[PDB]
Amino acid sequence: IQDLSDNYENLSKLLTRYSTLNTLIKLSADPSAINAARENLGASAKNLIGDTKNSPAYQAVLLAINAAVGFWNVLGYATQCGGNANGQESTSSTTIFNNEPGYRSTSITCSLNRYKPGYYGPMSIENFKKLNEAYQILQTALNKGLPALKENNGTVSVTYTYTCSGEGNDNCSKKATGVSDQNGGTKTKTQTIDGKTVTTTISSKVVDSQAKGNTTRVSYTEITNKLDGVPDSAQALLAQASTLINTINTACPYFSVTRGKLCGFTEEISAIQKMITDAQELVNQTSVINEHEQSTPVGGNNGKPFNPFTDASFAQGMLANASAQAKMLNLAHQVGQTINPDNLTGTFKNFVTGFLATCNNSPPGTVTTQTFASGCAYVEQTITNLNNSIAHFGTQEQQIQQAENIADTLVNFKSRYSELGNTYNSITTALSKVPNAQSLQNVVGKKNNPYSPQGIETNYYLNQNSYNQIQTINQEL
């Protein structure tokens, strides 16, 4: 019998594929099972793109965004910045950006002079402005709340200010800001973001050192930026998060809390770039689902019985729909795994547990004097809510898998049905090589079906009892 262990192994493996294929074939030949799977796809799609708390897709998008914001909240205060316009070194230019996580301040001050901005040096004012604008947009949208993935018409208004002090400072100058007058001029432009018409209003105001309220006693300009109609959407915010982390990686400025270059946090930046990319690909799947609705009846709803060989035009779209939902769930889990401290070690884990997933500072998008050196982007809570939503989606995931399997079977029905017969033949052959042949031959059987109009000439059967015994013997050897 010990010489029959490979025989029972092959027989057990074939019978499992036989039963799985047989059940899948019977499912995909049944219009009621098909319509139940198509109805499940519609409901799980509505949850994926319509929910917030209970959508793993939504939670993963929020996590990728918050990891980027929290990364800058940890390191922004220690980041060296300064200089003049177009990355030129400055003599005595002090440029302060408000609503930024500075050291014991709600502002980051850029006042490093006599050093040219660049890699491993100070971040240029041009790069900080690019960084700051994305930071303010993200924080304002996160404060309002990221809408569900199906939402394409949500907007926010974003307002932020920066001041220019010191002799020779051309950062709040006209060619930099492109206004007109600096003491009272204002400019209204339009910049189309993600297909949205965004109205931008830039204002300039000069405050001489003599003025009641100017406790700084240092003649300074103030630039106020007002963006109207900024898209608050998954795709739009992921692009802003991409701009934030990539501006950090591109400028790679010097920092000192340890000291070095910001792009030296190579593990953190690689993780955030991957999470943003995975989240963007996750969001891209919504249009695949949108263009493949499963609501309309199929079959199987005409005069004659459903034929899986000819009445399965809908299967390709059903497969694309289920494929997109499975891909959304897998990518959502991938975003969690990338940043989850339980999967990290060394310096990367210490960064997440000690800094990114904490908050010394409170509504989302809040900048306080204690924000610095802390993530303050609810990274810890979002990881928990993402994994909670994945567990909540377990039943729906299973239904997506079944739908996927049914749709894949219908697309390849001729080949899958033919594989079922070939598997039956390999089983009967393998049965002839196990001793005392006429004992368990009941395990598989087939009957011709002439007067059956589904185009399926042969029905395949399986003795669940004899199937069970063969599996136990296989387990015994």
Short mmCIF file of C-alpha atoms in Angstrom, two decimals:
data_model
loop_
_atom_site.label_atom_id
_atom_site.label_comp_id
_atom_site.label_asym_id
_atom_site.label_seq_id
_atom_site.Cartn_x
_atom_site.Cartn_y
_atom_site.Cartn_z
CA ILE A 1 0.00 0.00 0.00
CA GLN A 2 2.93 2.29 0.69
CA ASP A 3 3.73 1.82 -3.01
CA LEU A 4 0.25 3.23 -3.74
CA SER A 5 0.83 6.55 -1.94
CA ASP A 6 1.68 8.45 -5.16
CA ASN A 7 -1.40 6.81 -6.78
CA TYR A 8 -3.69 8.06 -3.97
CA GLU A 9 -1.97 11.47 -4.11
CA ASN A 10 -2.65 11.88 -7.87
CA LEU A 11 -6.14 10.49 -7.53
CA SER A 12 -6.92 12.88 -4.67
CA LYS A 13 -5.53 15.86 -6.60
CA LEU A 14 -7.54 14.96 -9.71
CA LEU A 15 -10.77 14.42 -7.77
CA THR A 16 -10.44 17.84 -6.13
CA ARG A 17 -10.00 19.57 -9.49
CA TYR A 18 -12.81 17.40 -10.88
CA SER A 19 -15.24 18.39 -8.13
CA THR A 20 -14.22 22.06 -8.25
CA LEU A 21 -14.52 22.19 -12.04
CA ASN A 22 -17.81 20.26 -11.98
CA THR A 23 -19.33 22.61 -9.39
CA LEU A 24 -18.05 25.66 -11.29
CA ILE A 25 -19.49 24.33 -14.56
CA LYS A 26 -22.88 23.68 -12.95
CA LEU A 27 -22.84 27.17 -11.42
CA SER A 28 -21.94 28.91 -14.69
CA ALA A 29 -24.68 26.95 -16.50
CA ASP A 30 -27.32 28.17 -14.02
CA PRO A 31 -28.82 31.61 -14.80
CA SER A 32 -30.01 31.98 -11.20
CA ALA A 33 -26.48 31.52 -9.86
CA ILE A 34 -25.16 33.92 -12.51
CA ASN A 35 -27.73 36.60 -11.67
CA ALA A 36 -27.07 36.20 -7.94
CA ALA A 37 -23.35 36.72 -8.59
CA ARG A 38 -24.03 39.75 -10.79
CA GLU A 39 -26.27 41.24 -8.08
CA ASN A 40 -23.52 40.70 -5.50
CA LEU A 41 -21.05 42.51 -7.76
CA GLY A 42 -23.34 45.54 -7.90
CA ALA A 43 -23.72 45.69 -4.12
CA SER A 44 -20.01 45.24 -3.35
CA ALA A 45 -19.12 47.81 -6.01
CA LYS A 46 -21.53 50.29 -4.41
CA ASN A 47 -19.86 49.71 -1.04
CA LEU A 48 -16.32 50.01 -2.42
CA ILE A 49 -16.94 53.35 -4.15
CA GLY A 50 -19.76 54.64 -1.93
CA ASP A 51 -18.62 53.94 1.68
CA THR A 52 -15.96 55.60 3.72
CA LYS A 53 -15.52 53.64 6.97
CA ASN A 54 -16.58 50.32 5.43
CA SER A 55 -14.66 50.66 2.15
CA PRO A 56 -11.12 49.21 2.18
CA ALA A 57 -10.48 51.15 -1.03
CA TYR A 58 -11.38 54.44 0.66
CA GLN A 59 -9.29 53.61 3.74
CA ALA A 60 -6.24 52.73 1.64
CA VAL A 61 -6.46 55.99 -0.31
CA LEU A 62 -6.75 57.91 2.97
CA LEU A 63 -3.77 55.99 4.38
CA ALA A 64 -1.48 56.80 1.44
CA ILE A 65 -2.44 60.48 1.70
CA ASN A 66 -1.97 60.62 5.47
CA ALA A 67 1.42 58.88 5.35
CA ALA A 68 2.67 61.61 3.01
CA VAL A 69 1.30 64.48 5.11
CA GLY A 70 2.52 62.90 8.34
CA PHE A 71 5.97 62.38 6.85
CA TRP A 72 6.38 66.13 6.31
CA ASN A 73 4.84 66.90 9.71
CA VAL A 74 7.60 64.79 11.29
CA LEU A 75 10.54 66.35 9.42
CA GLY A 76 9.41 69.77 8.20
CA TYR A 77 10.61 71.64 11.29
CA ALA A 78 14.17 70.29 10.96
CA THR A 79 14.38 70.97 7.21
CA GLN A 80 16.80 73.67 6.08
CA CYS A 81 15.22 76.20 3.72
CA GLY A 82 15.94 79.69 2.47
CA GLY A 83 17.42 81.63 -0.41
CA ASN A 84 15.96 83.90 -3.07
CA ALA A 85 13.81 83.36 -6.16
CA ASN A 86 14.89 80.72 -8.70
CA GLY A 87 17.10 78.89 -6.22
CA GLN A 88 19.56 81.77 -5.91
CA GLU A 89 21.52 82.13 -2.69
CA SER A 90 20.46 85.07 -0.53
CA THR A 91 22.23 87.56 1.72
CA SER A 92 19.58 88.33 4.35
CA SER A 93 16.22 86.99 3.14
CA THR A 94 13.75 85.67 5.72
CA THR A 95 10.72 83.91 4.12
CA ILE A 96 8.14 82.51 6.56
CA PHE A 97 5.37 80.12 5.46
CA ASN A 98 2.34 80.08 7.75
CA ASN A 99 0.27 77.05 8.77
CA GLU A 100 3.33 74.79 8.63
CA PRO A 101 4.64 72.46 11.38
CA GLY A 102 7.60 74.55 12.49
CA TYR A 103 9.65 74.11 15.64
CA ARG A 104 7.30 75.17 18.46
CA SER A 105 5.46 77.22 15.84
CA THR A 106 2.62 77.09 13.34
CA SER A 107 5.04 78.51 10.75
CA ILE A 108 8.21 77.30 9.06
CA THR A 109 10.82 80.05 8.67
CA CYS A 110 13.22 79.96 5.71
CA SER A 111 16.19 82.13 6.66
CA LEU A 112 19.39 80.28 5.73
CA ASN A 113 21.63 82.73 3.86
CA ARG A 114 25.04 82.56 2.17
CA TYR A 115 24.35 79.00 0.96
CA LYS A 116 23.03 78.08 -2.47
CA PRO A 117 19.90 75.88 -2.30
CA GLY A 118 20.18 72.37 -3.67
CA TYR A 119 20.77 68.71 -2.91
CA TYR A 120 22.01 68.19 0.67
CA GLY A 121 21.68 71.94 1.19
CA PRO A 122 18.78 74.28 1.88
CA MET A 123 15.52 73.73 0.06
CA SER A 124 14.85 76.52 -2.41
CA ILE A 125 11.91 78.85 -1.85
CA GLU A 126 10.56 77.69 -5.21
CA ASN A 127 10.51 74.07 -4.04
CA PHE A 128 9.06 75.05 -0.66
CA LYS A 129 6.26 76.98 -2.37
CA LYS A 130 5.50 73.91 -4.49
CA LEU A 131 5.66 71.78 -1.33
CA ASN A 132 3.61 74.23 0.75
CA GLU A 133 0.80 74.56 -1.80
CA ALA A 134 0.26 70.80 -1.93
CA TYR A 135 0.50 70.64 1.87
CA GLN A 136 -2.18 73.31 2.35
CA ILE A 137 -4.48 71.69 -0.23
CA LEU A 138 -4.11 68.29 1.43
CA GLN A 139 -4.64 69.63 4.95
CA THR A 140 -7.69 71.67 3.92
CA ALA A 141 -9.25 68.73 2.07
CA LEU A 142 -8.48 66.31 4.91
CA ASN A 143 -10.11 68.75 7.34
CA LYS A 144 -13.28 68.81 5.25
CA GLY A 145 -12.96 65.06 4.72
CA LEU A 146 -12.06 62.96 1.70
CA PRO A 147 -15.31 61.98 -0.06
CA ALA A 148 -16.17 58.51 -1.27
CA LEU A 149 -14.40 57.24 -4.38
CA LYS A 150 -17.52 57.75 -6.50
CA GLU A 151 -17.39 61.50 -5.76
CA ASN A 152 -15.92 63.61 -8.57
CA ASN A 153 -17.59 66.99 -7.91
CA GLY A 154 -16.37 67.76 -4.38
CA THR A 155 -14.33 70.93 -3.95
CA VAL A 156 -12.62 73.02 -1.27
CA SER A 157 -11.35 76.57 -0.95
CA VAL A 158 -7.72 76.83 0.17
CA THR A 159 -6.12 79.94 1.68
CA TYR A 160 -2.51 80.24 2.82
CA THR A 161 -0.07 83.07 3.52
CA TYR A 162 3.68 83.67 3.43
CA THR A 163 5.74 86.71 4.52
CA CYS A 164 9.01 88.14 3.14
CA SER A 165 11.35 90.00 5.46
CA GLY A 166 14.95 91.12 5.21
CA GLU A 167 16.89 93.30 2.79
CA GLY A 168 17.15 91.86 -0.71
CA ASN A 169 14.23 89.42 -0.36
CA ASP A 170 12.62 88.96 -3.75
CA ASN A 171 10.47 85.94 -2.77
CA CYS A 172 7.26 87.96 -2.32
CA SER A 173 8.31 90.09 -5.25
CA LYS A 174 6.20 90.81 -8.37
CA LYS A 175 8.09 88.53 -10.78
CA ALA A 176 7.88 85.71 -8.21
CA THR A 177 4.19 86.31 -7.32
CA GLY A 178 3.25 87.95 -10.61
CA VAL A 179 0.76 90.36 -9.01
CA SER A 180 1.33 94.11 -9.87
CA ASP A 181 1.49 96.58 -6.92
CA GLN A 182 3.05 95.01 -3.78
CA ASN A 183 1.40 97.09 -1.12
CA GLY A 184 -2.17 96.48 -2.30
CA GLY A 185 -2.11 94.65 -5.61
CA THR A 186 -4.04 91.46 -6.29
CA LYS A 187 -4.23 88.96 -9.16
CA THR A 188 -6.94 86.49 -10.21
CA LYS A 189 -5.83 83.63 -12.49
CA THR A 190 -7.21 80.20 -13.43
CA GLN A 191 -5.34 76.86 -13.35
CA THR A 192 -7.25 73.74 -14.42
CA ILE A 193 -6.53 70.92 -11.96
CA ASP A 194 -7.71 67.38 -12.79
CA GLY A 195 -10.18 68.81 -15.30
CA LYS A 196 -11.54 71.28 -12.73
CA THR A 197 -11.53 75.04 -13.31
CA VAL A 198 -9.62 76.37 -10.28
CA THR A 199 -9.73 80.12 -9.67
CA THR A 200 -6.61 81.44 -7.93
CA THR A 201 -6.43 84.88 -6.29
CA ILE A 202 -2.99 86.13 -5.21
CA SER A 203 -2.81 89.28 -3.09
CA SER A 204 0.21 91.33 -2.00
CA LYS A 205 0.46 93.64 1.00
CA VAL A 206 3.48 95.60 2.27
CA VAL A 207 3.76 96.23 6.02
CA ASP A 208 6.39 98.82 6.88
CA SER A 209 8.32 98.34 10.11
CA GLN A 210 6.44 101.31 11.61
CA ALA A 211 2.83 100.26 12.31
CA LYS A 212 0.77 99.48 15.42
CA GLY A 213 0.61 95.68 15.58
CA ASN A 214 3.88 95.07 13.72
CA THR A 215 5.68 93.84 16.88
CA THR A 216 8.40 92.37 14.57
CA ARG A 217 9.53 95.96 13.67
CA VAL A 218 10.90 94.68 10.29
CA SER A 219 9.27 96.02 7.02
CA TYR A 220 7.75 92.90 5.40
CA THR A 221 5.51 91.85 2.53
CA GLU A 222 2.66 89.34 2.90
CA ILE A 223 1.35 87.16 0.05
CA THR A 224 -2.11 85.60 0.47
CA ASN A 225 -3.05 82.76 -1.88
CA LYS A 226 -6.72 81.86 -2.33
CA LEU A 227 -7.70 78.83 -4.45
CA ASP A 228 -11.38 78.42 -5.26
CA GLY A 229 -12.89 75.19 -6.57
CA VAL A 230 -9.93 72.93 -5.74
CA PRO A 231 -10.96 69.29 -6.35
CA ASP A 232 -11.39 67.28 -3.15
CA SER A 233 -11.27 63.79 -4.64
CA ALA A 234 -9.21 60.62 -4.29
CA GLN A 235 -7.40 61.13 -7.61
CA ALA A 236 -6.82 64.85 -6.99
CA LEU A 237 -5.51 64.39 -3.44
CA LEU A 238 -3.28 61.45 -4.38
CA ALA A 239 -1.68 63.73 -6.98
CA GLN A 240 -1.10 66.38 -4.31
CA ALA A 241 0.38 63.73 -2.01
CA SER A 242 2.60 62.60 -4.89
CA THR A 243 3.77 66.20 -5.35
CA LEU A 244 4.51 66.49 -1.63
CA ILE A 245 6.67 63.37 -1.27
CA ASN A 246 8.42 63.84 -4.63
CA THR A 247 9.29 67.48 -3.95
CA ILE A 248 10.93 66.25 -0.75
CA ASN A 249 12.78 63.55 -2.69
CA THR A 250 13.80 65.88 -5.53
CA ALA A 251 15.01 68.78 -3.40
CA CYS A 252 16.49 66.38 -0.80
CA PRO A 253 17.51 69.26 1.50
CA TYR A 254 19.75 69.19 4.54
CA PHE A 255 18.13 68.61 7.92
CA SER A 256 19.13 68.46 11.58
CA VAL A 257 16.81 67.44 14.41
CA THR A 258 20.74 63.10 13.89
CA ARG A 259 21.30 65.06 10.68
CA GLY A 260 21.62 64.55 6.95
CA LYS A 261 19.53 64.71 3.79
CA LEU A 262 15.76 64.27 3.54
CA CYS A 263 16.07 61.81 0.67
CA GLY A 264 18.22 59.70 3.03
CA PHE A 265 14.95 58.43 4.52
CA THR A 266 14.98 56.03 1.60
CA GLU A 267 12.76 53.36 3.17
CA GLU A 268 10.10 55.88 4.18
CA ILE A 269 10.06 57.61 0.79
CA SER A 270 9.95 54.31 -1.12
CA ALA A 271 7.01 53.19 1.01
CA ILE A 272 5.06 56.43 0.52
CA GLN A 273 5.69 56.43 -3.24
CA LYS A 274 4.48 52.83 -3.43
CA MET A 275 1.37 53.49 -1.32
CA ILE A 276 0.43 56.51 -3.43
CA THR A 277 1.04 54.56 -6.65
CA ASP A 278 -0.96 51.56 -5.40
CA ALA A 279 -3.76 53.89 -4.28
CA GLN A 280 -3.86 55.61 -7.68
CA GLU A 281 -4.05 52.22 -9.41
CA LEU A 282 -6.75 51.23 -6.92
CA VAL A 283 -8.78 54.33 -7.82
CA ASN A 284 -8.25 53.67 -11.54
CA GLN A 285 -10.29 50.48 -11.11
CA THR A 286 -13.46 52.47 -10.36
CA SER A 287 -13.84 53.41 -14.03
CA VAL A 288 -13.42 49.75 -15.00
CA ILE A 289 -16.33 48.90 -12.68
CA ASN A 290 -18.31 51.91 -13.92
CA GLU A 291 -18.04 50.80 -17.57
CA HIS A 292 -19.17 47.23 -16.71
CA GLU A 293 -22.42 47.42 -14.78
CA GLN A 294 -24.00 44.07 -13.89
CA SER A 295 -27.56 45.33 -13.30
CA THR A 296 -29.11 44.47 -16.66
CA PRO A 297 -30.64 40.97 -16.90
CA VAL A 298 -28.81 38.32 -18.87
CA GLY A 299 -29.43 34.90 -20.22
CA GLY A 300 -31.50 33.31 -19.95
CA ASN A 301 -34.32 35.95 -19.96
CA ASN A 302 -35.32 35.23 -23.67
CA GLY A 303 -37.60 32.41 -24.86
CA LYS A 304 -35.16 29.41 -24.61
CA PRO A 305 -32.90 27.92 -21.82
CA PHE A 306 -29.50 29.55 -21.19
CA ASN A 307 -26.70 28.20 -23.39
CA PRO A 308 -23.24 28.79 -21.84
CA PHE A 309 -21.55 28.40 -25.23
CA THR A 310 -23.56 31.10 -27.02
CA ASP A 311 -25.49 33.21 -24.46
CA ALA A 312 -22.38 34.30 -22.52
CA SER A 313 -21.64 37.60 -24.27
CA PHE A 314 -21.82 39.36 -20.89
CA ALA A 315 -19.11 37.20 -19.30
CA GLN A 316 -16.13 39.31 -20.40
CA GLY A 317 -17.60 42.43 -18.81
CA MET A 318 -18.64 40.46 -15.73
CA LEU A 319 -15.06 39.19 -15.47
CA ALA A 320 -13.62 42.69 -15.87
CA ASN A 321 -15.96 43.98 -13.16
CA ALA A 322 -15.09 41.23 -10.68
CA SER A 323 -11.41 41.49 -11.65
CA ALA A 324 -11.41 45.22 -10.87
CA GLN A 325 -13.02 44.71 -7.45
CA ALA A 326 -10.56 41.96 -6.52
CA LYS A 327 -7.68 44.18 -7.65
CA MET A 328 -9.02 47.08 -5.56
CA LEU A 329 -9.13 44.88 -2.46
CA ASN A 330 -5.66 43.43 -3.05
CA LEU A 331 -4.15 46.88 -3.62
CA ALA A 332 -5.94 48.21 -0.53
CA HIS A 333 -4.34 45.46 1.58
CA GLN A 334 -0.98 46.17 -0.07
CA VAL A 335 -1.14 49.81 1.04
CA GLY A 336 -1.70 48.66 4.61
CA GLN A 337 1.07 46.06 4.56
CA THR A 338 3.57 48.64 3.28
CA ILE A 339 3.30 50.89 6.35
CA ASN A 340 1.95 48.54 9.05
CA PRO A 341 4.50 48.59 11.91
CA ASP A 342 3.89 44.87 12.49
CA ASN A 343 5.58 44.18 9.12
CA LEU A 344 8.50 46.59 9.68
CA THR A 345 11.75 46.42 11.62
CA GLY A 346 14.87 48.43 12.35
CA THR A 347 14.94 52.17 11.74
CA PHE A 348 11.84 52.08 9.51
CA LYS A 349 9.67 50.60 12.27
CA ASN A 350 11.06 53.10 14.79
CA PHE A 351 10.15 55.95 12.43
CA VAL A 352 6.55 54.73 12.10
CA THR A 353 5.87 53.70 15.70
CA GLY A 354 7.84 56.57 17.22
CA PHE A 355 7.00 59.45 14.91
CA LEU A 356 4.79 58.88 11.86
CA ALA A 357 1.99 57.03 13.69
CA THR A 358 1.90 59.51 16.60
CA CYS A 359 0.85 63.11 17.27
CA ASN A 360 2.21 65.47 19.92
CA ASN A 361 -0.59 67.83 19.05
CA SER A 362 -7.72 67.41 17.15
CA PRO A 363 -9.44 67.55 13.71
CA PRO A 364 -7.57 66.39 10.61
CA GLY A 365 -5.53 69.12 8.90
CA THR A 366 -4.79 70.92 12.17
CA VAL A 367 -1.36 72.58 12.53
CA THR A 368 -0.29 73.51 16.08
CA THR A 369 2.96 74.51 17.75
CA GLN A 370 3.39 70.88 18.89
CA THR A 371 2.75 69.22 15.50
CA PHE A 372 6.46 69.02 14.66
CA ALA A 373 8.35 65.72 15.07
CA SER A 374 4.97 63.93 14.95
CA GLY A 375 2.79 62.61 12.15
CA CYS A 376 -0.51 64.08 13.36
CA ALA A 377 -2.24 62.65 10.28
CA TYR A 378 -4.19 59.86 12.02
CA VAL A 379 -1.88 57.30 10.41
CA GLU A 380 -2.34 54.89 13.32
CA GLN A 381 -6.14 55.16 13.28
CA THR A 382 -6.30 54.81 9.49
CA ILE A 383 -4.24 51.60 9.58
CA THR A 384 -6.70 50.21 12.12
CA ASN A 385 -9.75 51.35 10.15
CA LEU A 386 -8.28 49.91 6.94
CA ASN A 387 -7.82 46.46 8.48
CA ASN A 388 -11.21 46.70 10.19
CA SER A 389 -12.82 47.45 6.82
CA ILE A 390 -10.99 44.55 5.16
CA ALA A 391 -12.36 42.18 7.81
CA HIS A 392 -15.82 43.72 7.40
CA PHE A 393 -15.56 43.09 3.64
CA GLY A 394 -14.79 39.37 4.03
CA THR A 395 -18.19 38.10 2.85
CA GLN A 396 -18.18 40.54 -0.13
CA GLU A 397 -14.64 39.47 -1.03
CA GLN A 398 -15.84 35.82 -1.19
CA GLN A 399 -18.77 36.84 -3.39
CA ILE A 400 -16.37 38.73 -5.66
CA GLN A 401 -14.19 35.61 -5.89
CA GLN A 402 -17.17 33.39 -6.80
CA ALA A 403 -18.36 35.98 -9.39
CA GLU A 404 -14.83 36.08 -10.80
CA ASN A 405 -14.75 32.27 -10.99
CA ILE A 406 -18.19 32.07 -12.62
CA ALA A 407 -17.32 34.81 -15.11
CA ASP A 408 -13.94 33.26 -15.92
CA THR A 409 -15.63 29.89 -16.45
CA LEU A 410 -18.20 31.37 -18.85
CA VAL A 411 -15.50 33.18 -20.87
CA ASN A 412 -13.60 29.89 -21.28
CA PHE A 413 -16.57 27.52 -21.06
CA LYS A 414 -15.66 25.31 -24.03
CA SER A 415 -12.12 24.81 -22.71
CA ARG A 416 -13.20 24.46 -19.06
CA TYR A 417 -15.90 21.96 -19.99
CA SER A 418 -13.39 20.07 -22.12
CA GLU A 419 -10.90 20.09 -19.23
CA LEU A 420 -13.58 18.51 -17.03
CA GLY A 421 -13.85 15.57 -19.42
CA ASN A 422 -10.08 15.18 -19.69
CA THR A 423 -9.85 15.21 -15.89
CA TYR A 424 -12.52 12.51 -15.74
CA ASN A 425 -10.42 10.43 -18.15
CA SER A 426 -7.29 10.85 -16.02
CA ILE A 427 -9.33 9.75 -12.99
CA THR A 428 -10.65 6.57 -14.62
CA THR A 429 -7.11 5.78 -15.77
CA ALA A 430 -5.72 6.36 -12.28
CA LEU A 431 -8.52 4.26 -10.76
CA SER A 432 -7.40 1.26 -12.85
CA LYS A 433 -4.02 1.23 -11.08
CA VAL A 434 -5.22 1.02 -7.46
CA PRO A 435 -5.53 -2.62 -6.24
CA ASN A 436 -8.91 -4.39 -5.96
CA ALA A 437 -10.12 -2.35 -8.91
CA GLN A 438 -13.85 -3.03 -8.64
CA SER A 439 -14.33 -1.49 -5.11
CA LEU A 440 -14.49 2.42 -5.37
CA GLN A 441 -15.24 2.85 -9.11
CA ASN A 442 -18.45 4.72 -8.03
CA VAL A 443 -16.37 7.84 -7.27
CA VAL A 444 -16.91 9.38 -10.73
CA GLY A 445 -19.60 8.87 -13.34
CA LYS A 446 -21.11 10.44 -16.42
CA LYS A 447 -24.37 10.24 -18.36
CA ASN A 448 -25.17 11.37 -21.89
CA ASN A 449 -27.75 14.17 -22.04
CA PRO A 450 -29.29 14.16 -25.53
CA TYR A 451 -32.58 15.97 -24.83
CA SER A 452 -30.89 18.72 -22.79
CA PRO A 453 -30.83 22.05 -24.66
CA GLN A 454 -27.91 23.81 -22.91
CA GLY A 455 -25.50 22.39 -25.51
CA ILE A 456 -23.87 20.28 -22.77
CA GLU A 457 -23.95 16.69 -24.01
CA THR A 458 -22.53 15.06 -20.86
CA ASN A 459 -23.35 15.57 -17.18
CA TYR A 460 -20.58 14.58 -14.77
CA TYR A 461 -21.27 13.14 -11.32
CA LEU A 462 -19.25 12.54 -8.16
CA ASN A 463 -19.88 10.08 -5.33
CA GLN A 464 -19.18 12.30 -2.32
CA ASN A 465 -18.87 9.24 -0.07
CA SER A 466 -16.22 7.47 -2.15
CA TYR A 467 -14.61 10.87 -2.73
CA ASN A 468 -14.26 11.22 1.05
CA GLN A 469 -12.67 7.80 1.58
CA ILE A 470 -10.07 8.31 -1.16
CA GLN A 471 -9.10 11.65 0.38
CA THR A 472 -8.70 10.05 3.82
CA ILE A 473 -6.50 7.25 2.45
CA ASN A 474 -4.37 9.88 0.72
CA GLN A 475 -4.06 11.65 4.08
CA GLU A 476 -3.22 8.29 5.74
CA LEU A 477 -0.18 7.81 3.39
#
